[PDB]
Amino acid sequence: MRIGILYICTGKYDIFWKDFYLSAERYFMQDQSFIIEYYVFTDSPKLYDEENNKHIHRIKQKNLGWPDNTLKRFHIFLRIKEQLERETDYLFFFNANLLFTSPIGKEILPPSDSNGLLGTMHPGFYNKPNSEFTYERRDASTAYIPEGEGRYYYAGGLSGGCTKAYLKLCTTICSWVDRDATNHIIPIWHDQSLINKYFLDNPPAITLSPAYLYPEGWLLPFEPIILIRDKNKPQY
Numbered sequence: 001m002r003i004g005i006l007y008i009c010t011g012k013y014d015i016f017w018k019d020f021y022l023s024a025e026r027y028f029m030q031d032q033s034f035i036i037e038y039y040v041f042t043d044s045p046k047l048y049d050e051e052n053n054k055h056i057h058r059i060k061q062k063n064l065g066w067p068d069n070t071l072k073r074f075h076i077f078l079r080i081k082e083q084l085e086r087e088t089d090y091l092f093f094f095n096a097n098l099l100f101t102s103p104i105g106k107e108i109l110p111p112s113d114s115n116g117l118l119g120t121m122h123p124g125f126y127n128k129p130n131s132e133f134t135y136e137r138r139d140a141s142t143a144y145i146p147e148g149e150g151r152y153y154y155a156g157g158l159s160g161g162c163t164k165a166y167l168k169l170c171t172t173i174c175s176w177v178d179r180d181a182t183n184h185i186i187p188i189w190h191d192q193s194l195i196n197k198y199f200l201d202n203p204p205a206i207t208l209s210p211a212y213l214y215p216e217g218w219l220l221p222f223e224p225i226i227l228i229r230d231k232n233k234p235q236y
């Protein structure tokens with residue numbers, strides 16, 4: 001089975017590629033049945049272990065700056081959609097500063113008879129009531145979610161599923177992003193708002209706990225499986 005990792009590390013975020021990659025080569029899908037393809041969108045000339053591992057696919061991408069780096073995130077995946085359709089069976093997106101600490105296996109693969117989508121609970125909202133979810137509340141936006149509706153507050157730092165269903169998600173959100181641009185709207189706060197809208201219409205087959213998005217330094221009711229490295233640490 002072929003597992004595709006989508007990874008954007010333009011500008012000052014390629015410092016995060018090395019330790020992410022090593023942790024991933026160690027803890028992520030290390031059953032010999034799986035093969036891992038890294039699709040690394042960056043402006044870096046060379047990536048760590050690129051000359052050794054043929055599954056590291058460097059794709060050229062410039063820094064768009066904030067927020068287009070976060071707003072056109074799914075635009076970036078779809079420029080190589082055909083390559084993904086023939087080389088991968090599952091796709092997973094990870095934030096640059098994410099870090100694996102414990103083994104992860106087939107338990108996070110959405111079953112083929114489901115919608116084949118995976119979402120992850122945001123660490124700042126897992127214990128909050130519906131009334132405090134910061135959804136997009138403007139009916140003029142494609143990311144609109146009325147008050148009282150919604151189940152979880154999903155995050156944008158980790159999402160995926162089977163390649164077909166996920167590219168379908170990429171295609172939809174791009175359209176939502178573009179339609180709002182015309183109507184003179186930037187959805188707030190975008191990396192999570194559009195995906196929370198999509199996961200409302202399409203309740204994901206798998207919902208990961210914030211143990212898969214554990215912010216460094218926090219005290220949460222979970223063992224951290226994936227850590228969100230503090231960006232403001234001096235070593236970065």
Ligand SMILES: CC(=O)N[C@@H]1[C@@H](O)[C@@H](O)[C@@H](CO)O[C@@H]1O
Pocket residue numbers: 070095122123155156157158191192213
């Ligand atoms: C994992 C998670 O939810 N992280 C998101 C991620 O999208 C990041 O870019 C930033 C906001 O842009 O912080 C957020 O919490």
